[model samples]
Target: IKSNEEPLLRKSSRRFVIFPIQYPDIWKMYKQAQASFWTAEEVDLSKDLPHWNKLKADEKYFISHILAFFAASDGIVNENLVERFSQEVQVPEARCFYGFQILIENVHSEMYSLLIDTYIRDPKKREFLFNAIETMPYVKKKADWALRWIADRKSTFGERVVAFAAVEGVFFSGSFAAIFWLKKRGLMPGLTFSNELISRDEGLHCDFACLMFQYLVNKPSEERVREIIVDAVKIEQEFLTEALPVGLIGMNCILMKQYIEFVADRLLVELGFSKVFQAENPFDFME
Candidate 1:
């Protein structure tokens, strides 16, 4: 299993360099991310607003919490990429990959803004939803979990990778299921397509996370990495409990929780860990 002796973490230059490509796999992902470009303005919000008015209170509540979580999500993930991942990595190719990652992050952010703008006309009401990240206990709980790992002082690089893997792979997946549930119920065309694109990018980001996790030559604590993922699953389940307490139509707390577990199991297996959770993704539309 001989490969280039290039190290993964090293000095990041003041200016990014992409020449002398190493980690061709990362460069390949960057290319795909570029090709997968989309904008929030591209989605038609015309139908979404009028249609949103027709939704029941419970359904709207569910959508609001999901939207708030997403509003708070990707930007912080981008921070991890910049602060820890791309900044310290020795590979120029991987740096270029993170460039596209930030672009996708901003585009996804724009998409969230557009959707919220379409739905909520008043400033204070919109503030309430976005502000929910701080005001809402459940929403902040998951966000806090993601933040903790990054802010943890004694964590290893591999542990950091596991934390990020769980961030994009585990935290985001259940919320995607929540949004996709609305799409399945024939609501919010804009959100459906926006999430479709964002979910695809998360898949790429998660793939990058797994490959990075494996390249950790020293190997992180299996116990610790597994703990991070399990912690992610737990934090996400708590958020789901609040977001969909009564559950909507076909989507319930049980189904959403199981969907996240399924993602965690898949993520662990890809990171060369055994599956610890034997849960089924209840949403067929997710297929």
Candidate 2:
């Protein structure tokens, strides 16, 4: 027989869950979030200016677009988190864990700007980048999609969790890979470290959403979740293609597409689903 305690996906009336928290999986995830706490200032930006000076036009373009997208990306997730996710989980522990995520999200948003403002010193360019959601078509497309998902009150809880996870897990991943790709080139030492911290936090956030994903039963259909992932992959490919038109190093639009599909499959499996797209991760340098 099942226990009387409320599950993670179900609403609970128990007000105080102080000891022996029932949701150990999420409780452990919350511990990991706290364990990984970091700040933007902890990372030194001194090396970035010299590195930025030496970069070619194509490389600079790639970095600029990435910074601009990421500059606003975390902020969007935080809005969704506050506006929806925290309320859906229902479990106090999970809400607390997601609350912690909000803090991490704000820090990441600040970190992206700090990296760009410190290195990319062109004043007008920085202004344009900071408002990527308004000025850039590709970014605006993505921003609109994110807001659309949360605005749909008819959306099932399962659908929202999966969609939000795909955003944090699938879409944001390409940008992280680009950052690490630069790290592989031994450029932008401090920027790479800050990204590493941000990446770690994103992993925990994705895991929390995936943990919620286990409960998708009769409400939202598999097709709906699949649609969400497919849409995400489509937009990400478009954005990456625009971000890296001429390609750089061993990376190009096609390779990034394959990488995202590979990531999509990984997310699929985590949700107890099979791979819809059989693709390989081209970035061997990444873990």
Which prediction has the highest lDDT against the true structure? 2
Cα lDDT of model 1 by residue, 1-287, tens digit: 11123267755472266676666787888888789887777888787887789888777877776676677765443355554676667677777777788777888888887887777788998777676565665556665775676666766677777877887788767778777777877887888888888898988889988887777776677787778889888877876765455375346677777888899989988999888888876778887
Model 2 / residue 114 / CA error / Å: 0.9
Model 2: pairs clashing at backbone N, Cα or C within 3 Å: none
Candidate 2: where are CA atoms >4 Å away?
A: 1-6, 9-13, 74-78, 131-133, 216-219, 243-250
Per-candidate Cα lDDT values, in order, are 0.74, 0.75
The sequence of per-residue lDDT tens digits that candidate 2 reaches over residues 151-260 is 57676567777877887788778888888988988999988888888887877788878887775454366677788888888888877766455275347778888898
- Evaluated at residue 159, the lDDT of candidate 2 is 74
164 Cα displacement, candidate 1 (Å): 0.8
